[model samples]
Target: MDMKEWEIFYNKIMEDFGFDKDKDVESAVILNNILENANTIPVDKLKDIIEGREVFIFGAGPSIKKHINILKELREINYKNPIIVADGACKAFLEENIIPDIIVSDLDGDLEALFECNRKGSIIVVHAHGDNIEKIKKYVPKLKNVVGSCQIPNYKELNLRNVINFGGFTDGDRCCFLAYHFKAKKLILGGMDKKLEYAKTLINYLKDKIEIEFLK
Candidate 1:
């Protein structure tokens, strides 16, 4: 898709998610930290890895349980690369003897499991909102290499660059958006069953936008 198409898509996302563009008080600080540390696995570097590899994003949706055996098999064979686990799914991943390379969430799920993942040296990307700034501030220091992003904006700013647009059923859609922006070669869909009532609408919004293959 061209920049114009992406802009319109982003606008629709902002409308759906109710993102505010003007307030950068909290997101700026965290985003700035990630942006400034270019020497480390910079955002661009992370983007590169995403572009080349097949990433599996696990969500907390109920369909995840249906593919537990398959996921466990994949996890055992695919230990060299990292798989991302959305909040709560971390526990499930661990229960299956699968170690998630990264954990992403807003900290609204199980705190103990989240903490356990942190203790086990997993990279945590804490999703933060304006209201959750204080929570992020309090929890960010405890985890290693904690990364985050703000909600998408209602309108695009010409001067604003380095924006990652996420458009999927859950966070997987968002991850795919990031991967696409970075030019990922392959994107896989895991824990994305169509059992949910809103699954069809969510899938329609993301189909044809990226190369998505279902794990099931």
Candidate 2:
């Protein structure tokens, strides 16, 4: 999509969701940082994971509990690789005794859990925002292997290497689009049951890129 199309899409998203563009600007800046850093991880390196292993992307939506039994079974079987936990899901996972291999977030939520994850030797991919540059300056120094970047203009055109897409969307499907861009072999979505009243609005903002399989 061109700049005009992007602008129209974003504007329509804002209108549909009743989001304040000015307020979300800061959030957008943070999201951009995540995209930038994600690109730095070479595609070849990401593809090196054992060929048959599955990567799990965890989100904090309420539906997570539905599959707790299966997750536990996987955990008991020592099924471990690169698990990316987004936002508050880190804490939720911890509460369930599930250790995340990597935690991705903008540092907008519980800081204690983030710090603990770092202490436990979990890789924390900090999502940076333009406004959070200063905060990152102070916090990034304390974390190990901390890296970040801003979102690119045409994310689909970029080579994401080896990333799986999972998560919840209220309206516009950023995560789903990102999965497609990364060329995920299998995109299994969770916490996206459209149970929340705000979910439709959020999905609306995502446009037409929502084809992942929903985990019941």
Candidate 3:
């Protein structure tokens, strides 16, 4: 993912949320330690898992509940890949007695479900931003399995070892970026219904170059 894009988005969100960079830097140190010591997946390893597979990413949008049954039914067929649940939507999948293959989060959603998903060996992609450093300190260490991503890189000596810089500010769009990055054959999005300019920009950028589907 591109750091320049991530930096701009991260700064805007943190400013809007009244985040303190200096304070988060300290928390980042603790966070990096937990991530560094914890078991992590090499970012490059995802290529094979997603190769030639349909990736259905779930966001915690209103449509998620609206379409929950449809998703479950589709999973019963031979999609040949597990669903990627973003944040709170993991709970929805778990309530269906279905654990996500991957959970993208920043420790903001159902914390209990997040930890349980981790325990079940689901790949948890924990994102660290200036505002969520405390959440990182509180939760990253407790996670049994994780992969880390940072919104900002090398801002005031914050260690980001084992952490990658992936694009997209929110968990929703980040999953979009990931599906593109990993080259998923079929990309399906749930819970993210708004027509984002960035989302359009991504689609338009690749409309002619490759294949991407945006469901309504």
Candidate 4:
């Protein structure tokens, strides 16, 4: 998403939710420093994984259980689709012994599952915001194949070379934005609940650009 367009939406979200932008920027700064020598995944490699692939972006909600079964059936049919899960949704995939290609989180979900997936070769897109500073310092260094993200207006302003502003607010829609950014052939979203209405709106705004479908 364009920085100009994002700022408009981001400002409104901060105002409505009373989120502190300064704190958010500080967290991003912290994450950027922690990732200095960490094993970082190259953006091109992430692009290779999603580009031209039929991607599944999973949200952490109850519907994920049913959606996972559908994923299994697709696998059974030999469909080589890429899976990208958001935060807690990783648990359902782990429960089924399915390793997603990418896991998007701000360290709010199951650390064990997140670590296991990292070990299992999933590229993690770690997001930083106002509330997750300690989590960033604690877990980010231990994780491998990671790329950092933030929700701020610009990364260059802070000289933040590690983290990026890839657009979208919450983890679920952030996954969608990442997929869209990388040129996924088509996007299948699952388990996006009522709480992610803004996320859905963001995805819908890009509907004409790519094939986007929500899994029931």
Task: Determine the backbone clash count of candidate 3.
Answer: 0
Model 1: per-residue Cα lDDT over 28-146, one tens digit each: 45544543432122355566456667677677666777666676666667444446777778888777767676676666665788788776767665554445555665666566656
Top lDDT hit:
4
lDDT of 1: 0.57
How many clashes in each structure? 2, 21, 0, 0
After the best TM-score superposition of candidate 4, give how far the Cα of residue 91 lies from its true spot, in angstroms. 1.0
Q: What's the lDDT for all of these models? A: 0.57, 0.51, 0.69, 0.87
State how far residue 193 of model 2 sits from its true place (Å).
5.6
lDDT of 3 by residue, 133-204 (tens): 778877777776577765554643544666665466567666756766778776777776533655555545
Residue 67 displacement (Å), model 1 = 1.8
Any idea how many clashes model 1 has?
2
Model 1 TM-score relative to the real fold: 0.70
Candidate 1 segments whose C-alpha is farther than 4 A from its true place: 2-41, 75-81, 154-170, 193-206
Which lDDT value does model 4 have at 77?
A: 77
Q: What tens-digit string does per-residue lDDT give for candidate 4 at 1-216?
A: 465788889998998789999989999999899888899988789888988888999887778888889889889877868899998778789999899999998998659888988999999999999999999998988999999999897778789998877788888888888998898988998876744678767878878778898888
Candidate 2, 127-190: lDDT as tens digits:
5333455565466656664434322233324343222222233212333333334444444545
Model 2 regions more than 4 Å off: 1-8, 11-44, 47-53, 77-81, 130-133, 151-178, 193-211
At residue 198, candidate 2 shows an lDDT of: 46
Model 3: residues >4 Å from true position, as ranges? Answer: 1-29, 153-159, 194-210
lDDT of 3 at 207: 46
Residue 43 CA error for candidate 4 (Å)? 1.8
TM-score of each: 0.70, 0.59, 0.79, 0.95
